[PDB]
Design a protein around this nucleic acid. Structure first.
Lengths: 59, 136, 377, 84
RNA sequence: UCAGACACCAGAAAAGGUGUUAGUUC
RNA sequence: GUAGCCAAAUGCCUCGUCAUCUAACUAGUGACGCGCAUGAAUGGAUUAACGAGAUUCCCACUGUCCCUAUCUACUAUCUAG
RNA sequence: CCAAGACGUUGCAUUCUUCGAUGUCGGCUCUUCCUAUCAUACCGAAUUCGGUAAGCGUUGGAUUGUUCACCCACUAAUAGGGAACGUGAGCUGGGUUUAGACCGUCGUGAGACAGGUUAGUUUUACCCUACUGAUGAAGUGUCGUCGCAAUGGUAAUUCAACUUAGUACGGGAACCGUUGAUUCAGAUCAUUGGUAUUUGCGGCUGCCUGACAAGGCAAUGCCGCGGAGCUAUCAUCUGCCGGAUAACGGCUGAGCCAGAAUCCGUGCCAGAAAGCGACGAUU
RNA sequence: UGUGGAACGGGGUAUUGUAAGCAGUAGAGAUCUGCUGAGAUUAAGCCUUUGUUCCCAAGAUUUGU
């Protein structure tokens, strides 16, 4: 089954990206290293122009 | 040693070679563990023994209760920062390397585990799975 | 004080460039007269590779009846045209080609195999052979009778319709395929009646067969002993270089041994990788070839944007488990496995759940353009 | 303890032994030409006495106990009589 | 089942053999 | 052979012995001294500060290493002289 | 060997070469051979000892310059030895190490010390061969296509869990089988990770083009992401059955049968550039 | 002289992250916001092409049963 990527807010098909779990056990699914690395830098998806979350909440 | 585990563990990327410091996950009183050897390591020249989630290692408590320090006791790697590939295609990696203190029979010395527990570790070791809060 | 096994296999040297571009089937399956007449080889082109999701139906395994992800190799295999037959007679010195019989009409694709410069040539190959075929078929009949009477091995000359594949090459690849099964008379009759006709890979392979893949590996050029042979890198303090073998021999024998690692060609070598399952034989005309039964979503094997450096596969293809020797668009030979195998891994049926056709030319995120337009505003 | 199962194939030309000392491996032995085996006693009859004796010896060697105390483990097949 | 083959010389022993060919004595 | 000091850059035997640090040290440090063959301007014993001096450990750090990979310019390479 | 394994008995320094110079220990690296077998395979004797057997393997560390050694571990096991005490135009230079210097002992002294202690330039291949890859004239009329295969090399290894089975046996097996791993090997790049001169896109600093926009310079200015390629036991795939046997057990009374990880072939790599065939066209 | 080849152009694909310009009832004049998942780059070892433009009916050498 498909899952929603955390940052890009798009569908991740099987065998794509990384799935990272924090010490708090929370689970974050990234589809590409770019979204992975942006999340590590603590970027807000609502402030990043190419994220579907920003697009949904703006326009 | 490793034959005291229930179940067969798949191959995964080794992310904790010898002399790696990992965080103590249980309430035993230790704060970090110092890996000195990994069980079931063959004979390969120049290659450090390396451990992954669910492996059993011999470790020394560098920081913790003084009675706990200055000795070797078995440990189980429960969390790994290096990425490993499950056979279904998902790549896993925890935020930090973590281990717990166990006896050679496989029963952990602590009473609870803090943080997520690798599914492979939980499947191999029922006691760790029983004491785990969440398995991922 | 310490030991370490040898670096590398001594059964593969000399590590020289292959003398051939197309893989040579060095062994054919043992002939069984009980079996019907059939082909034991095929010749395709490596289109590319992708990955799939499959439910593992192996009892007793830790992931029985649960999904797994496997990398698969797609080889475009348009039907081969049988253009001739050649007979082999067993002798105290080995097999000897007794004679060869060609078809009346040979296409331009296979005729280009005989010319280095087809543009400037008068295209005169097989012209007199075609003339004698038309005017006197008795000489051909005597040749076929000679094969039936004396030859004990029969091999059909087949060429590949390379113009159907998206390749700039126009010389069709030609090979001999041993025809096992039945009597020698049956093989000759099968060969003669199949002159100028096409044989499809669906007839030969059966969607689960363990086959061998033969081809010349991708060339890495000249390499040092660290990369060519896997020796340990010398310390950072080394003078005059560290990516080399420190000692190349003892005092006696006063020579460098053939067993010592050296630099040179590391790549473009002939390999025969064994035990590759066919996961799916897809038909070119069918538009649902990459769509499984649990996925629906009518789609083709070619990912979005085409196979990187290959294009779009429109003909019959074969999806194999795992990697195969060689780069993309390289001619590969698929032959029937010589050994018998009764393993559960080799005999389990394969039923795919989903085949990835996202673009391999980057980080693809959409399977088909139809849902790509859905996601994009 | 474990009964020994004997199966005859090709009119006794092939003898298959199963459940020997509880083992799950079926031991298949092909008798020499001219020897016929029929059925806890097995009778092998033929014209070549040497071939019959060799087939009996091969059957006895196939039904052999390994890495066990011979005094305690007496399971096996032994020739009882040999005449005309 | 790794016989023997010409002095110097390229080296071997005690003791043995259900080896074999002979002999000596009860 | 006093005050001192020491298996000290001086102790053969010697991997001295005990403690110390390490999972493990013929290391290092502390203490002991019938010290092959220590010792007082041939200066003895301390010693802040200084030292491209000798040595030991610890945190930080790292391709030093596991275990190698990739990139760049100049070479090498091919050509003219 | 001998009988009361004691007693016995039989076996497995020299100065010839080099002083018109053979680079002097250890480690690292890499290869190969021997068997006097540590583990694995096969039997045999009461967890213990032998026979065939060198096929494959034989580790990570603490100290010490050390070969031996000794420790903490792991492991199926961490056997021994040769190769100019294998291996410095291969490395390093810790030991050795001329000249500096210190100490102790010895000497009236200069000095000595096979005592300790620090500092102390490690040159050269472009030649021949060998090895490793790369071309190549010519027999076969010429050029090409498709092959044959002499010979050479060769490759896989080990463990655990489960089922057998708490059965046989009187606490505890074993074959088959299954599922995964260890070491090795040949590939491969769908996914993941690494790499960045895509100088592809964005960002930042100092200066410069009068300003904006757009750019340049900073020996690739720097930072984020970065396709493609390359690459990772950091990623994936793949790696088997025939025959003769040794130990040894049988059969009949030499011959034949049984039996090892051994030998030899199927399989795999090379293709004799002076081994060969079939075929196509022949100015 | 071809379902030719090359040069560009279009579409797909992918990388980055909303361009130049303009307006504002945004802004304590850095910045925000609309047009704007836009623009730029995209085979140099990506795919595809009824697109346009252009090129090629060869020169030299060696070759016999």
């Amino acid at each position: 089954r498909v899952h929603t990527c955390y940052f890009c807010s798009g569908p991740v098909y099987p065998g794509h990206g990384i799935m990272f779990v924090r010490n708090d056990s929370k689970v974050f699914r990234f589809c590409r290293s770019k979204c992975h690395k942006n999340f590590k830098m603590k970027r807000n998806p609502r402030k990043v122009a190419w994220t579907k979350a920003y697009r949904k909440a703006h326009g | 040693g490793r034959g005291a585990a229930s179940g067969t563990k798949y191959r995964m990327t080794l992310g904790l070679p010898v002399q790696a410091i990992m965080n103590c996950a249980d309430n035993s009183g230790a704060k970090n563990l110092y890996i000195v050897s990994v069980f079931g390591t063959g004979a390969r020249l120049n290659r450090l023994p390396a451990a992954s989630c669910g492996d059993m290692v011999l470790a020394t408590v560098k920081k913790g209760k003084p009675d706990l320090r200055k000795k070797i006791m078995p440990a189980i790697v429960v969390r790994q920062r290096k990425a490993w590939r499950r056979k279904d295609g998902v790549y896993l990696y925890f935020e930090d390397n973590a281990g717990v203190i166990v006896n050679p029979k496989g029963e952990m010395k602590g009473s609870a585990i803090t943080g997520p527990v690798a599914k492979e570790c939980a499947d191999l070791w029922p006691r760790i799975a029983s004491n785990a809060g969440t398995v991922v | 004080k310490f030991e370490q096994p040898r670096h590398g296999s001594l059964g593969f040297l000399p590590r020289k460039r292959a003398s051939r571009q197309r893989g040579k089937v060095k062994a054919f399956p043992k002939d069984d007269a009980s079996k019907p007449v059939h082909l034991t080889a095929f010749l395709g082109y490596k289109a590319g590779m992708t990955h799939i999701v499959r439910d593992l139906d192996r009892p007793g395994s830790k992931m029985h009846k649960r999904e797994i992800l496997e990398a698969v190799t797609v080889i475009e295999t348009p039907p081969m045209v049988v253009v001739g037959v050649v007979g082999y007679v067993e002798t105290p010195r080995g097999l000897r080609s007794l004679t060869t019989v060609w078809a009346e009409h040979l296409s331009e694709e296979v005729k280009r195999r005989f010319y280095k410069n087809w543009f400037k040539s008068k295209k005169k190959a097989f012209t007199k052979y075609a003339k004698k075929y038309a005017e006197s078929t008795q000489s051909i009949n005597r040749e076929l009778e000679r094969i039936k009477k004396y030859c004990s091995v029969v091999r059909v000359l087949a060429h590949t319709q390379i113009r159907k594949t998206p390749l700039a090459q126009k010389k069709a690849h030609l090979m001999e395929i041993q025809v096992n099964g039945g009597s020698v008379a049956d093989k000759v009759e099968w060969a003669r009646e199949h002159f100028e006709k096409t044989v499809d890979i669906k007839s030969t392979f059966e969607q689960n067969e363990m086959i061998d893949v033969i081809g010349v590996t991708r060339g890495k050029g000249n390499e040092g002993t660290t990369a060519r042979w896997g020796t340990k890198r010398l310390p950072r303090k080394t003078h005059r270089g560290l990516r080399k073998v420190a000692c190349i021999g003892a005092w006696h024998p006063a020579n460098v041994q053939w067993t010592v690692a050296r630099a040179g060609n590391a790549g473009y070598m002939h390999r025969t990788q064994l035990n590759s399952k066919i996961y799916r034989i897809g038909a070119g005309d069918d538009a649902k070839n990459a769509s499984t039964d649990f996925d629906a979503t009518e789609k083709r094997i070619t990912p979005m944007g085409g196979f990187v450096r290959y294009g779009v596969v429109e003909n019959d293809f074969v999806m194999l488990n795992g990697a195969t020797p060689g780069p993309v668009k390289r001619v590969l030979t698929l032959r029937k496995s010589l050994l018998t195998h009764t393993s559960r891994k080799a005999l389990e049926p394969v039923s795919l759940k989903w085949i990835d056709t996202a673009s391999k030319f980057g980080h693809g995120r959409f399977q088909t353009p139809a849902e790509a337009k859905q996601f994009l505003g | 303890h474990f009964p020994i199962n004997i199966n005859l194939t090709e009119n006794g030309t092939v003898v298959e032994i199963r459940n020997f000392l509880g083992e799950r491996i079926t031991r298949v032995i092909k008798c020499l030409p001219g020897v016929t085996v029929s059925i806890d006693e097995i009778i092998l009859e033929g014209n070549s006495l040497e071939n019959v004796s060799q087939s009996a010896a091969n059957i006895k060697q196939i039904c052999n106990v390994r890495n066990k105390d011979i005094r305690k483990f007496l399971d096996g097949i032994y020739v009882s009589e040999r005449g005309n």
